[PDB]
Amino acid sequence: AMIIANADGCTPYEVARGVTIVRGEGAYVYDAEGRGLIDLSNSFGSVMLGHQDPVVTEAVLKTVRSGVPAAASLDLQNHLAEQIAGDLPGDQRVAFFKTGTAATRAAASAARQVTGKRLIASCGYHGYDLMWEFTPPGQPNSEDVLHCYHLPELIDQVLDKHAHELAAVIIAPDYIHVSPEYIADLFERCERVGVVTIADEVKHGYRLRQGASVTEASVVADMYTYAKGISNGWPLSCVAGDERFLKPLAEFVSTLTFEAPSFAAASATLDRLAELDVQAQLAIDGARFVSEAAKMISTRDLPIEMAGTGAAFQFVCAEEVEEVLLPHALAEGLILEPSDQQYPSACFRGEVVDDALERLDRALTTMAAARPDLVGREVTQLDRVNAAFCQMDGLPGRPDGWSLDQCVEYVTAQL
Ligand SMILES: Cc1ncc(COP(=O)(O)O)c(CN)c1O
Ligand SMILES: [Cl-]
Ligand SMILES: [Cl-]
Ligand SMILES: [Cl-]
């Protein structure tokens, strides 16, 4: 009777609200009529290996059938921490949580404890907690967090005004609409004035490479947060970082922080990502998908542009165009996430990619025939900016011809 209060919100599979998903296996989910759909949501990117991965499933099932209680499997817990710490440069300790929001709030709390300072600066989305609620540039939210929307000019403003008062800056990286060098510059500006940095890798950690995405962008951070990439859909997250920041998290423990099934899933997941060369293969397979998708769009003269590549790409279009693309893709058995990147898994390889392209080709054909008025429409700068803001929760640099004031006005109007 709408008794659940937080069902409406940022849940995946909104495009499929008119259908009923009952099964998942590999690259596919299946509806109640037995129809298979290629899944590019993958529980908002939490499923990096594929649904019902055989190795993850056997590890979980063995742990469930042992009945071993929480916090008794010390070797497994420490092994997982060693796996995570060993993929980061430096000497990290690891504190485990159950959601990405818990991990980012804990990292912020650790910075506050060490520095004795309160204010936090932020780029991107860090979770549902009120401390991560977006407010206009220069306006601290109810928990003393300032939002900079990935603009170096807005970072500079906060640093020029509060750098001596900042406990930390927390940046969720993204590379679809900006370069690795652009992201690195955001971190470096804060580093140069001595501000603690948190790389929020909840989305991209273990997706783009076997470790933190920022490492390949020539960035090091004081703490890193992970969740989606590490556990194939099981509820586990962490803060990994330098000892001086991880020591204040010693008592950040819940009754079920160490429930065994999720640790078994995560340790198996990290091993399988390495064994199957997942991120490097996705870079190849996703690049092929995005190139061929772009060609299909072009021959059909539809107002869509592909952005990104590999494991993180996006169908850039106006909202009213996306609202046609998504149902038409669903009708052809292809689940796309709206107003975001797509999230292919390790099973998005081989014949699955060709299957997805065939379904997209059919969807583009029906879309052009159902909505001939969209054929030949141009994609505008505003379309591109809107799509970036939806995807990365910030601006992809100051758009051409926009003043900083226009950027601030635009972001304010999105809230
Ligand atoms: C970049 C990033 N940071 C943190 C979070 C919050 O994590 P969670 O949804 O697991 O609470 C999310 C959403 N998963 C995210 O995309
Ligand atoms: Cl599959
Ligand atoms: Cl939690
Ligand atoms: Cl800029």
Author numbering: 0 to 414
Relevant lines from the article:
GenB2 acts as an isomerase, converting C2a into C2 by changing the stereochemistry of the chiral center C-6′. The structure of GenB2 shows, as expected, a characteristic PLP-dependent enzyme class I fold. Similar to other enzymes from this family, the active site of GenB2 is located in a deep cavity formed by a groove in the interface between the two protomers of the dimer, and each subunit contributes with essential residues for the substrate and cofactor binding.
GenB2 was successfully produced, and the enzyme purified close to homogeneity showed a pink color, indicating copurification with the coenzyme. Although we have made several attempts to obtain the GenB2 structure in the resting complex (internal aldimine), we did not observe the formation of the Schiff base between the coenzyme and Lys227 in any of the tested crystal and solved structures. The PMP molecule forms an extensive hydrogen bond network with protein residues. These residues include the critical catalytic residue Lys227, which interacts with the primary amine of the coenzyme, and the conserved (in type I PLP-dependent proteins) Asp199, which interacts with the nitrogen of the pyridine ring of PMP. Tyr124 also performs an edge-π interaction with the PMP ring.
